[PDB]
Amino acid sequence: KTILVKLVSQAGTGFSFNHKRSRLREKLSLLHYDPIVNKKVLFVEQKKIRSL
Amino acid sequence: ERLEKYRSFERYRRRAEQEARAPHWWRTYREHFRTQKLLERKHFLRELRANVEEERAARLRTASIPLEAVRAEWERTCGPYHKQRLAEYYGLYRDLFHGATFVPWVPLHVAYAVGEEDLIPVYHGNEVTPTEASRAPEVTYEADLWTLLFINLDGHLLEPDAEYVHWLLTNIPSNRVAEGQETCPYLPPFPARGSGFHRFAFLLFKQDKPINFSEDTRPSPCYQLAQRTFRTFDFYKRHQEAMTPAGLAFFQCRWDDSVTHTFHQLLDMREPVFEFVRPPPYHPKQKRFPHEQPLRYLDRYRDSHEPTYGIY
Amino acid sequence: KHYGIKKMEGHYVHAGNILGTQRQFRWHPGAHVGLGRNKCLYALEEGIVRYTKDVYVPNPKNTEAVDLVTSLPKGAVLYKTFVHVVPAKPEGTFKLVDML
Amino acid sequence: LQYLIDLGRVDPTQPIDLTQLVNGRGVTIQPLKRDYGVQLVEEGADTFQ
Amino acid sequence: HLASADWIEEPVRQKIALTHKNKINKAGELVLTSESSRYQFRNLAECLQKIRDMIAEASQVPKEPSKEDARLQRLRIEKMNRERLRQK
Amino acid sequence: ARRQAREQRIAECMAKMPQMIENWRKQKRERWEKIQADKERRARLQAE
Amino acid sequence: KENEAVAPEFTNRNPRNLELLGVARKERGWATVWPNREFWHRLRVVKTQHHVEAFVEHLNGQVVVSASTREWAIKKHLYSTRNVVACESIGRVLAQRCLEAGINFMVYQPTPWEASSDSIKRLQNAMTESGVMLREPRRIY
Amino acid sequence: LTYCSTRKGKRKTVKSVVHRFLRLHSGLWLRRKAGYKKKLWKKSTARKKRLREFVFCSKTQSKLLDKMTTSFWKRRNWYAGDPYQMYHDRTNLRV
RNA sequence: UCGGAGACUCCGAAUGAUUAUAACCUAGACUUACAAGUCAAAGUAAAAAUAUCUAUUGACCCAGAUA
Ligand SMILES: [Mg+2]
Ligand SMILES: [Mg+2]
Ligand SMILES: [Mg+2]
DSSP states (O other): OEEEEEEEESSSOOOEEEEEEETTSOOOEEEEEETTTTEEEEEEEEEEEEEO | OOSOBOSSHHHHHHHHHHHHHSOOSSOOHHHHOOHHHHHHHHHHHHHHHHOHHHHHHHHTTOOOOOHHHHHHHHHHHTHHHHHHHHHHHTTHHHHHHTTOOOOOOSOOEEEEEETTTEEEEOOTTEEOOTTGGGSOOEEEOOOOOEEEEEEETTTOSSOSSOBEEEEEEEEEOSSOOSSSOEEEOOOOOOOOBTSOOEEEEEEEEEESSOOOOTTTOOOSSOOOHHHHOBOHHHHHHHHTTTEEEEEEEEEEEOOOHHHHHHHHHTSOSOOEEEEEEOOOOOOOOOOSSOTTOBTTHHHHTOSOOSOOOTTO | OOOSBSSOTTOEEOTTOEEEOOSSSSSEEOTTEEEOTTSOEEESSSEEEEEEEEEOOOOSSOHHHHHHHHHSBSSOOOEEEEEEEEEOSOSOEEEEEEEO | OHHHHHTTSSOTTSOOOHHHHHHTTSOOOOGGGTOOOOOOOSTTTTTOO | OOTTOTTSOHHHHHHHHHHTGGGBOTTSOBOOOOOOOSOHHHHHHHHHHHHHHHHHHHHSOOOOOOOOOHHHHHHHHHHHHHHHHOOO | OHHHHHHHHHHHHHHHHHHHHHHHHHHHHHHHHHHHHHHTHHHHHHHO | OTTTOOOSEEOOOOTTHHHHHTOOOOOOOOTTSSSOOOOSEEEEEEEOSSOEEEEEEETTOOEEEEEETTSHHHHHHOSOSSSHHHHHHHHHHHHHHHHHHTOOBOBOOOOHHHHHOHHHHHHHHHHHHHTOBSSOOOOOO | OOSSOTTTOOOOOOHHHHTTOEEOTTSOEEEOOTTTTSOGGGSOHHHHHHHTSOEEOOHHHHHHHHHHSOGGGGSOOOOTTOTTGGGGSOOSOOO
16 A cells, blocks of 8 residues: 655745655655745655555 | 558658648648850869869868859849849738739949948848938949839828939939939938838839920939829839849838938928737627626626726 | 537637637637647637638657657658637737827 | 815815825725725825925 | 936936936936836836935946856847857 | 845755755665566576 | 828738747647647657658648758768768758748757767757757747 | 525525635626545646636526525625726626 | 446445645636546646546535644
8 A cells, every 4th residue: 555645845844745755665855846935955755645 | 552651751741741832622721821155064073073173072071162253143144033022022022013913134234322431232131221221322334225213112191102203313324323314312211100111112114205394303412301202103014115124132221220310300290109919809898797707707797997986 | 528619619708708628629729829738729819710620740759749740651641630819909009198 | 185175175284194084085094904004105196286 | 327327426317318318318318217006106116116225236237247148148149140250 | 134034045945956866866876777688688597 | 190190000911020039929729749849849760761851830831941861962071861860960051041031940849769879969969059958938828 | 605694584694605615796607626636636727727727607507696696795895905896797798 | 326347147335545735817628317437738826747556426404624
């Protein structure tokens, strides 16, 4: 089963977006667009929202 | 099966391109939307083969060619043919002669003088700023009478079909143009701001015999646009018997700083400024109930963006 | 669902009007007709829809299309049906904003 | 405001207040419906002399 | 009238004229208009403010032009193409 | 004060942002390079 | 003043006026069909068995300016009709014809192998150094 | 609906409407898109964009809500700084 | 209940993998009792334009979470 996780902006902003990763994979990290910063930044996994 | 199959995409592309040009009964997108000279060529080619240096350059891919010699030779043989397409593309034939087309035969060379160091050549369709056009261009061509004039196809403002001529030279004897009477004096180009690129063309007509040109003559200087304007097709029609076009050279012009001076100082009119206006956007007729439409639906149909309080 | 030709020939078509929806590439896009991800065809300029059949030349990059084209015999040339929208409006006109 | 002053329903020489607007029926106010007063508006500035 | 605009500093008047010569009328009086409201006051405010901006931009030196937009880039290419074209 | 704390917080992380992005890019390259290290090259060596 | 009188609506008759301005239309369709039709002018170069020719054509397909090695003047001055330098020479010759014509911007979409071709690369290099640009600007609304 | 209430003898507003819909004085009604806060992780970005918008009501739906609300909710409200100030009127509509 | 195929007989689903990660805003339309679900120019913004097939649903209330 796959787990829903919360990827959080590492630029110090509170912006976060939920993505899906496999429970057997390592914590996902994905460059993404932060609206507040108007620049691309790294998003790192913070919490496990649920299992789906 | 027996027929060969394309092994390369290019050959199919050539076949596909050929078919597109070829007519088809079903509706298609296109519908809706001498000998001695040749012998001389063979002798020259044989000389090229013999030349070891040419072979060495080709194998080393270091060969170079003088473009100027080819350019001069190109004008002599098929310049006319290529020049015709250039004029044909720009629609000079249709507008100037009301659909009549004449193949250029006598090369027409005109270059605008810039100071004294050099003079800008009037290449066919090339862009030339009016600022550089301040001085009357130098005209060079070979002749044994002749008439050459500058015509502004779309320059005219009041009347769309009408045109303005910078100057008209008539009864030109041989190459020399000073002897020929100057019916119209030169005026700097004056393309209006915001009217877009203006195509200015030069027409050279062979003159069989001298003809009275009292109508063509204009007061020097003439500052009346209505007096200046005439119809080229009408002018050619009057002298069509003894006048036949042989040389055509045109250039592109746009608004520039020098244009401002011309409009007021001597043209004596306020400069016209034009704005490009696209067709207003289309919306469906406004409904009393804009069901399923976002709240922005109302802002589409409100002309005034400021609050109105009515009776209150 | 309800896949069909919404706009028949001779019908005025506004910018965003959707000409038709197809489950598969029955009708291929034509001039000034964009193609949606769901493969629906939408017009791009105001015009009159006209349907024509033209030679289909695939992009070199895709392998499957190139291989099929090569497999065709030299004489044979394939065709596809296209939907076109002939523009019916001038993009802009010139007006005298002011005389200075 | 100008229309009221023109017809003699407001006395410009005297100071103006909410009482003299209501007295001249220039405005209608309902305190029970959360009215907190009258806001002047920009409509008609050009004609205002 | 710019000539009679004694209130404007004379040196800056020279700079403003040429920079925005297009807005300058034939008589030499700067002509500026705005049409964006139903109230002459707000429309007039636009007219006055543009004068202040013109004076401020002329008085101040914008040392950094930085980069240009697509429109200017196309014009620069056109000018460069013409210069090489005029070999003669 | 909260706005100033907010602003300064973002700036500090943004200053450190370029290095982290490079590190994240480096890891992806490091994973990717190793994937094909033995995906076919090891097979080619075995075939030899 | 008679001169001052001007019609409110101007009608520029130059076909190329709008295109030079940048508001002229482009074919924005043909999503599934290659080559793309998003071009005011397309420069197509055809390599034949013995000759290589380059043609610039408008949307209508009419070749405004054509450069071909088969022409007598070029081939008399050109050693071998088909050669990499010959592609270079025609590129420069076509550029001068394009520059004098006034067409400075075109779109050329070679196929992947055609792009890989050194001669096309060399010919393209001639256009760049000659000032011809192979990328046209996007239409402005 | 209470057509005649015992204590006062008047019609009674349905508060399920007051908490979901906004009436503009012209007669239009505004509403949200059902599910705009639900299962956002499986909705497409275009899908989510549509949901965030405010949508109008039909003639029937508008007629219904006008029967379920009393005249007090159909009056003119002079709120200073109202972000719906411009939308209470219809302009350039012929019909 | 949803959808694929056949002309009622068969197959699947409450999606998983791949994804150097997919913005905002906004003309016109499809579909449709309502509700839901589709496509999208322009403008603007990140970066150096569309995630990849196959196909995939659950309202309101009400409870959870966070800065
Ligand atoms: Mg009241
Ligand atoms: Mg609905
Ligand atoms: Mg867009």
